[PDB]
Each structure stands twice: as structure tokens, then as C-alpha cells.
């Protein structure tokens, strides 16, 4: 009941007792491990108060007033508010704590050494899609900070009945369009071909190119969503060049600077925040490996290998591996030369080991998802490959949720 | 109870019902996933017969005579033999079936598309360490087959009381020595520094160099183990050259051709085979990535990057990644040019997807360990990165076991 994780490169051993406070379930049983399944698995007033109490007992414990007067009155205050409304409202401090610890608790995030340096924007007074656009625009401007990126989260009103939900229908605030073709090929980003078309249905006028920044589809208080174009001056992009190969400019690639996830759900004290877009900065491999080289994404290994004059006849010439390394040198170089924040997989995975040591020491553990923490190239030459990790669900947390277009009681 | 695994690059979905026949436990619970822990977790006559029956019910089912006369008589025959001796003996056919399915069932092995082409050598008549040397020598000769490698397993007598065990104390039949230094550095292979010294204690005369093939320490029928030198003519090695960089010869590296694991335990029908060395061929990344570039192994990224004239000042120049790809191009090229069998991570991971489709179709599933199946470089540009896998323990199986020097009632 007091488990041990080992690093097999350093022989360092850590003891996890934090998993005892774990509540949710993982998908694994004693007879089957599901640690490589991508997505594993109304709210009544009965269930609500224990979730509120559990959250408030760790909030007040955290500020060194566990069980004090203010704790008991706040516990009774929330209990009384859940009697009257069968829900409740977080104090501003409780909202900032909740958000930072949802990030702290995200076992799939290698960036978490920053978890406490997070700027929380309280958008709970928002009522319309236009107000969402405004709040989201100010999030982008602040987070980008002229390339010196800053982590931030914007939190729209919590779910109530369920049919009144705030949702951002984009997967990321900033995301390139994807259009199919007559010959069945795909221009832009094949990830977003369905969403790109959805914007066209609600009325987008698409400039059918490669790197066309999608509009925002914003749904407020359960109403039908509404399209808005982020002003291009707020959309910072980085043209990708190589520090050796000058044909790399001719590739004419580019990516946006600010990764900002917008389709997830934030749980705090049993309250559900269906619209909570959050942003930090990129680890280089996300762009150079997955975005650029996934077969079902931009899929550019073909062209880069050609221009490098590689032996592409055989699998075993490792031409794919060789062109993958050049591409990620190029992403990093281009971002850095522009003073736009980015971290390479070596620095980020090292920081995550250091972060792990902090969490085990001053918190008794750090939930971690090896399948997601290990980067998608050069796995074993990063220290996290050799680090055993225990995965488990702690709350507050970021959860997946269905896409709004599959659940929204459409209204035409 | 009828689970679904998805490939997120091909959108292919498979249905696993094979996990229902799973027996052993994984280490995971409903509240904690341990899929990245390296090693998770006498035998009485009471427990023995169900294990025998379970094995015999699937053996006879496999040859299309489930429940026939021969099945029932064999079930009674084994029951009667477990009454008299509280153990039993496998028929030769049952031994070959068991071994092939232990391999078939090995969720950490990406090579399993070959699982039925396995040469089983019955060494159960062996009684002395000299006989073990002889059997092991014939295994090496056969498996190597002039570079056209062939999978094989040699099976020494099963454990009985426990204090009479056959063990091979080497981790692999062929393995390079590791010696420390006055300045605390290490020559050869740091993995085997303890075992290298153990051979020196029992009497080895070490040629203190880099790539010195260790002697065999062979323990028969519980007696103290005995040293034997494999004749060098049976030890096929491959000098590593690069197809472009001619300084790569000056690196003067080499590896042995035949990977032959010797420290594992084979369970068949409740019977334990403590000495069962098995051999196939290498996936290139095992040598070029782990053996050569693990920090606690040969650790050569330093020198290869130097001779490539790389910017080693910064982490983010990705010089480590760049020199890692060259090194694995070199391992593959050198093995192939010599007609010594080897598979590159791209071909091997593709074959494992194809194998997965076969197992789900004609068997209802394929237990698979994503943490181990995904290769240690270029992860997401192989199809197994994008393949969800269910892990679970089926029997017959290969299990870990303590090193004999930590358990053997030593006798001096
Ligand atoms: C500040 C720098 C950050 C870095 C370098 C970073 C890095 C990463 C990476 C590489 C992933 C894997 C994503 C993928 O492969 O699709 C990830 C996942 C994730 N990150 Fe972090 N992140 C950062 C900030 C944040 C912030 C500020 C939050 C929340 C407020 C956050 C929450 C998450 C969550 C919830 C996931 C899991 C998403 C999923 O399960 O699909 N991250 N992060
Ligand atoms: C024929 C070509 C084969 C290939 C290409 C292959 C490939 C691999 C690789 C790359 C690993 C990971 C090893 C590591 O990273 O330490 C592995 C593990 C394993 N292989 Fe296969 N293998 C082959 C044949 C076999 C055979 C013939 C057997 C048994 C008779 C076998 C049984 C296993 C087992 C039990 C493991 C897990 C070892 C562990 O858990 O540490 N393999 N294989
Ligand atoms: N459609 C598919 N399914 C699919 C389903 C779910 C997902 C989940 C993808 N999470 C995107 C994500 C999440 C968190 C952080 C980042 N990155 C960052 N650095 C930051 C962003 N904000 C602050 S930091 C990116 C992805 C794909 C697929 C098709 N082919 C392969 S997957
Ligand atoms: N000492 C350490 N612990 C440690 C504990 C356990 C282990 C287990 C390592 N299995 C070695 C192995 C197993 C199966 C197949 C192959 N390869 C093949 N292709 C074949 C061989 N035969 C037929 S195919 C190699 C490894 C290390 C470490 C220190 N640093 C990092 S690990
Ligand atoms: C099938 C598999 O679980 C899927 O590819 C996962 C693997 N690990 C990952 N790791 C990260 N960071 N991001 C991903 O999208 C995935 N995908
Ligand atoms: C900590 C972690 O489980 C350990 O590095 C595992 C990861 N995956 C692996 N995968 C393979 N094939 N071989 C290994 O030795 C390991 N080591
Ligand atoms: Zn698990």
C-alpha cells in the first residue's frame, strides 16, 4: 500500500503514498492493463457535497488552516448553498487553486514543473459568445506576450442543468484548417477536416489553403455556437527554416506559436467547467514529429527525405529517421531564433524527472503516464524512458468530453 | 467483457475476447496502472493438477481432439502420475507446443509473428554441466546457421524439489565482459560487471578488453556451477561500419550476431523449467540504441557526435538524435552486408501489426505490452505507436526469476 518506483538509469528509488488519495478509476483491472488505450472511461446534490468537502479539506489544508474556523464555516456555507441550489460557487482563490492542481494532477503532461506558474482568468461573468471571443482574445494576447509565452487558463461559467453549457467547439484556439480535394487528397491539416467543414456549414468563407487559421466556434449558455475570426495580429506564427539546408525555406512550412487546448473539461470540487481553454508552450516534438510527420497529419517525411537525397528505396536505410531528426532541429532553431518560447524533448524530459523528485518529496508522489510522457522520438536517450511511473487519477482534473456537435440538442 | 482496441493511424478496430482466458495478474488495479514497472509480480500437488488439466485441455483442443479418448486417458494418466510423484512429465509434442505458446504469449516480444517457427531441443536427459555445455554449443551452432539465423530453444530438466535446479548463470549465452577500472570508469559492458567478476571468482582468467565473450557458468541438478568457454568458431560477430562515414571503422565497434536469452523461466502446465535458453535474431535498435547508447551501457553518443563534427554545446541542437540515427544505419548495414540476419524497427513493427490481426482473427486477441513493443527511437513513425494494445498474462509463459547467485544454497 506504499509503492516504489525506480529509475533504471540512475538507480534512484522513490516511494509513492500519494496514490492512496486517488479516487477515480484507471480502466486497468488486476487481470488486464489498459495503459495504452487512448480514451478510457447530470450530477445530483447527493454526490455533490462529498466532492465539495474533499476539495475544501485539501484547499484549507494547503493554506495551513485545515479544520480552522474559516474551514468549518466555509464547509457549512457550501453545504447550505448546495441545499438551496443543489450546486455552489467557488471563491476566486478556490478557483485558482483548483485550476493549478488540475494541471499539477495531469499525468499525461510532461510540462508540469510549471504547474504553479499559471495565470487564471475568471470568465464566470460571461454570458454571450461575443463575450467569449473577447475573453479568448485577451487570453491569446496575454499568453503570447511577444513570443515570451506565459501559461494561462480562461474559465467560463460552470455547467448547471446540462442543457446550458459553455463550449468552445475548436480543439485548440489556434489551429490550421483541413480541406479535402476532388482527388480525395487533403490540403492543410487532415486532423480538422470535419471541424473545418462545420465552420463552412455555419457560414465560414474558407480561403482553401495550407495554413489557414480556423475561426472560433463559441457556444454560450447552451445556445447555438457563433463564428469569430481572431485578429491576425494576435496570431503569432513561426516560419520554419533549417540552420544548414537552405532548401528548407522552399518547403515553406510554418506553425503557430501558442498551443491552447480548448475542448477539455475542468473538474473542481464536483463542479464541471465545460469551457476552460488553457495554453502554455510547445515541446518541439509535438510539431516536428507528430504534426509534421504523423501519416494522418501533414506527412512530410516524403518531401524532406527527397530533398536530402536519401536512399528511399529500402525501409532499412532509416531515411525516415534521418529526415525526422533534421525536421525537429529546424523547428527548434526557427522558434528560438525568433525568441518564441519552445522546449526541446531533452530539456523537457529532464525537467520532468526533477519535477517528479519534488512531488514525491513534498507531496508523496506524482501520477504519471509513461505512454504519454516519453517523447515520440529518441525515447531511450531521454531520462523518462528509464523512469518507472505510477499512473492514477487525482482530483481536481482535466477530463475529456464529447465534441459539442455530437451532443448539443441542435436548434437550427 | 469483450474489449475493443483501436489503431489511431488506420482507424482499424479489433475485438479482444482472448483476455477472458487470462489467469495470472498484471500488477494493475482499478485505481493504479503499473504498466511501466520493469519487474512486476515450492509447488504443491494440490495446485498442480488444475494447471496440468488447463494445459492439456488447450493442447488437445489445438490438435482438434478436445475431449476425445486420448485426451481423457492423458488427463487420467497425468492425474495418476501426479498422485504417485506429485509431478509429471510432458510428452515431446506437449513440450514443443508449450514452448511455442510461451513465446506466442510473450506480450513484450515484437518478433512474435515467427512464434510457430521455433526449433525445440529437448535437453531433459541432461545431468551434468558438461552435458549442458554440449547442448548449449549445439544450440549456438544450429541457431546461427552461418548467419541465416534460426529461432531455437533448449530445455533442461524441470525443477523438482527446488534445491535441484538447472540454471545458466549468464544473462545471455553470448555476452561481452564488463570490468571496472582504477579511476572508477568501466571497460566493456557495464551491464555485466558483477557477472564478469563472478566468473573471475570461480576462476575465469579475464583478457580485460572491450568485447571479450564471457564464459558460460552452468549449474546442473543444483550443484555448484562450472565455467566453460564457447569455442570462438561458434561465436559469430559483426564488425560495425558505416556506408558513408569511413571513420566509423576507426570506432572499431562490433557485436555478436546471436541474441540468446538464458536467465528466464519457462512455465508449461504448472511445470517450471529453470534453464531454457532461447535465441532468435536482433532488431537493430537493441544494439544501436540500447546497447551502444544507453548511458549505463557502452554510451558512445559522445564519440560519434564528435567525429560527425556536431554542435554539442547545446541540448537543443539535437546532436544526440542525429548521431543516434547514423549509428543504427551502421548496425543494419554491417549486419546485412555480412548476410547475418537482422530486422530494422520499421519492418519488425509493421510485422507485429500484421501478427496482431492474425491473433485477433484466429485466436480472439494478442496480449501486448505497448511500453516494450514501441521501439526506443522514432516511436511515432512506426505503426505500433498508434496501436492500442491490451496486456494480460496467458500461460504457457516466460517468467523472470532471481539470479542464481542470490538464491543458491552456496556450497563452496
Ligand atoms: C507550459 C508548458 C507545457 C508543456 C511544455 C506541455 C507539454 C505537454 C505535452 C507534450 C503533452 C502531450 C500532448 C500530446 O501529445 O497531444 C501535454 C499534455 C497535457 N497537458 Fe501539458 N504542457 C504545458 C502546459 C500545460 C498547461 C498550462 C496545462 C493546463 C492548464 C496543461 C495540461 C495538459 C493536459 C491536461 C494534457 C493531457 C491532454 C490529453 O490527455 O490529451 N499543460 N503537455
Ligand atoms: C525471431 C526474432 C525475434 C525478435 C526480432 C525479437 C524481438 C524482441 C525484442 C526487441 C524484445 C525486447 C527485448 C529488450 O528490449 O530487452 C523482445 C523481448 C522478448 N522476446 Fe522476443 N524476439 C525474437 C524471438 C524470440 C524468441 C524465439 C523467443 C522465445 C522462445 C522470444 C521471447 C521473448 C521474451 C520472453 C521477451 C520478453 C523479455 C523480457 O520481458 O525482458 N523472442 N523480443
Ligand atoms: N483524432 C485523433 N484523436 C485524438 C483524440 C484526442 C487527442 C488529444 C490531443 N491532445 C492535444 C494536446 C493536449 C494537451 C497539450 C497539448 N500540447 C501542448 N503543449 C499544450 C496545449 N496547451 C497548453 S500546453 C496538446 C488527440 C487525438 C487522432 C488521429 N490520429 C492520431 S490521434
Ligand atoms: N540491469 C538492468 N536491469 C534489467 C533487468 C531485466 C532486463 C531484461 C532484458 N531482456 C533481454 C532480452 C530479452 C528478450 C529478448 C531480447 N532480445 C532478442 N532479440 C532476443 C533474445 N533471444 C531471442 S530474441 C533481449 C534488462 C535489464 C538495467 C540497467 N539499465 C537499464 S536495464
Ligand atoms: C495507441 C496509443 O495509446 C496512442 O498512440 C498514444 C500513444 N502515446 C501518445 N503520447 C502522446 N504524448 N500523445 C499521443 O497522442 C499519444 N498517442
Ligand atoms: C522504466 C521503464 O519501464 C523501462 O525503461 C522499460 C521501458 N520500456 C522498455 N522496452 C524495452 N523493449 N526494453 C526495455 O528494457 C524497456 N525498459
Ligand atoms: Zn495498467
Curated annotation (Swiss-Prot), chains A, B:
<feature type="binding site">
    <location>
        <position position="172"/>
    </location>
    <ligand>
        <name>L-arginine</name>
    </ligand>
</feature>
<feature type="binding site">
    <location>
        <position position="371"/>
    </location>
    <ligand>
        <name>(6R)-L-erythro-5,6,7,8-tetrahydrobiopterin</name>
    </ligand>
</feature>
<comment type="function">
    <text>Produces nitric oxide (NO) which is a messenger molecule with diverse functions throughout the body. In the brain and peripheral nervous system, NO displays many properties of a neurotransmitter. Inhibitory transmitter for non-adrenergic and non-cholinergic nerves in the colorectum. Probably has nitrosylase activity and mediates cysteine S-nitrosylation of cytoplasmic target proteins such SRR. Inhibitory transmitter for non-adrenergic and non-cholinergic nerves in the colorectum.</text>
</comment>
<feature type="binding site">
    <location>
        <position position="282"/>
    </location>
    <ligand>
        <name>L-arginine</name>
    </ligand>
</feature>
<feature type="binding site">
    <location>
        <position position="281"/>
    </location>
    <ligand>
        <name>L-arginine</name>
    </ligand>
</feature>
<feature type="binding site">
    <location>
        <position position="400"/>
    </location>
    <ligand>
        <name>heme b</name>
    </ligand>
</feature>
<feature type="binding site">
    <location>
        <position position="372"/>
    </location>
    <ligand>
        <name>(6R)-L-erythro-5,6,7,8-tetrahydrobiopterin</name>
    </ligand>
</feature>
<feature type="binding site">
    <location>
        <position position="36"/>
    </location>
    <ligand>
        <name>(6R)-L-erythro-5,6,7,8-tetrahydrobiopterin</name>
    </ligand>
</feature>
<feature type="binding site" description="axial binding residue">
    <location>
        <position position="109"/>
    </location>
    <ligand>
        <name>heme b</name>
    </ligand>
</feature>
<feature type="binding site">
    <location>
        <position position="286"/>
    </location>
    <ligand>
        <name>L-arginine</name>
    </ligand>
</feature>
<comment type="subunit">
    <text>Homodimer. Interacts with DLG4 (via N-terminal tandem pair of PDZ domains); the interaction possibly being prevented by the association between NOS1 and CAPON. Forms a ternary complex with CAPON and RASD1. Forms a ternary complex with CAPON and SYN1. Interacts with ZDHHC23. Interacts with NOSIP; which may impair its synaptic location. Interacts with HTR4. Interacts with SLC6A4. Interacts with VAC14.</text>
</comment>
<comment type="similarity">
    <text>Belongs to the NOS family.</text>
</comment>
<protein>
    <recommendedName>
        <fullName>Nitric oxide synthase 1</fullName>
    </recommendedName>
</protein>
<feature type="binding site">
    <location>
        <position position="385"/>
    </location>
    <ligand>
        <name>(6R)-L-erythro-5,6,7,8-tetrahydrobiopterin</name>
    </ligand>
</feature>
Amino acid at each position: 500500500r506504499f509503492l516504489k518506483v525506480k529509475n533504471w538509469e540512475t538507480d534512484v528509488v522513490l516511494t509513492d503514498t500519494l496514490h492512496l488519495k486517488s479516487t477515480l478509476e484507471t480502466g486497468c483491472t488486476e487481470h488486464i492493463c489498459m495503459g495504452s488505450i487512448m480514451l478510457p472511461s447530470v450530477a445530483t446534490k447527493d454526490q455533490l457535497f462529498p466532492l465539495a468537502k474533499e476539495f475544501l479539506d485539501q484547499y484549507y489544508s494547503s493554506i495551513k488552516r485545515f479544520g480552522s474556523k474559516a474551514h468549518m464555516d466555509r464547509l457549512e456555507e457550501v453545504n447550505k448553498e448546495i441545499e438551496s441550489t443543489s450546486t455552489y460557487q467557488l471563491k476566486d482563490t478556490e478557483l485558482i487553486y483548483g485550476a493549478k492542481h488540475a494541471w499539477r494532477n495531469a499525468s499525461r503532461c510532461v510540462g508540469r514543473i510549471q504547474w504553479s506558474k499559471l495565470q487564471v482568468f475568471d470568465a464566470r461573468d460571461c454570458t454571450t459568445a461575443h463575450g467569449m471571443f473577447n475573453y479568448i482574445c485577451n487570453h491569446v494576447k496575454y499568453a503570447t506576450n511577444k513570443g515570451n509565452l506565459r501559461s494561462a487558463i480562461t474559465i467560463f461559467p460552470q455547467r448547471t442543468d446540462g442543457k446550458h453549457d459553455f463550449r468552445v467547439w475548436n480543439s485548440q484556439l489556434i489551429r490550421y484548417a483541413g480541406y479535402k480535394q476532388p482527388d480525395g487528397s487533403t490540403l492543410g491539416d487532415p486532423a480538422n477536416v470535419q471541424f473545418t467543414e462545420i465552420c463552412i456549414q455555419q457560414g465560414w468563407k474558407a480561403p482553401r489553403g495550407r495554413f489557414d487559421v480556423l475561426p472560433l466556434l463559441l457556444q454560450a449558455n447552451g445556445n447555438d455556437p457563433e463564428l469569430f475570426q481572431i485578429p491576425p495580429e494576435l496570431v503569432l506564427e513561426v516560419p520554419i527554416r533549417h540552420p544548414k539546408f537552405d532548401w528548407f525555406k522552399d518547403l515553406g512550412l510554418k506553425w503557430y506559436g501558442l498551443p491552447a487546448v480548448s475542448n477539455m473539461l475542468l473538474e473542481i470540487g464536483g463542479l464541471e467547467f465545460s469551457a476552460c481553454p488553457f495554453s502554455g508552450w510547445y515541446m518541439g516534438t509535438e510539431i516536428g514529429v507528430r504534426d509534421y510527420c504523423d501519416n494522418s497529419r501533414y506527412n512530410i517525411l516524403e518531401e524532406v527525405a527527397k530533398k536530402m537525397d536519401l536512399d528511399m528505396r529500402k525501409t532499412s536505410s532509416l531515411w525516415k529517421d534521418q529526415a525526422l531528426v533534421e525536421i525537429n532541429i529546424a523547428v527548434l532553431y526557427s522558434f528560438q531564433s525568433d525568441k518564441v518560447t519552445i522546449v526541446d524533448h531533452h530539456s523537457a524530459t529532464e525537467s520532468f524527472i526533477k519535477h517528479m523528485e519534488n512531488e514525491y518529496r513534498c507531496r508523496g508522489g506524482c501520477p504519471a503516464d509513461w505512454v504519454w510522457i516519453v517523447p515520440p522520438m529518441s525515447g531511450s536517450i531521454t531520462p523518462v524512458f528509464h523512469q518507472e511511473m505510477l499512473n492514477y487519477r487525482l482530483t481536481p482534473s482535466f477530463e475529456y468530453q464529447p465534441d459539442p456537435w455530437n451532443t448539443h440538442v441542435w436548434k437550427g
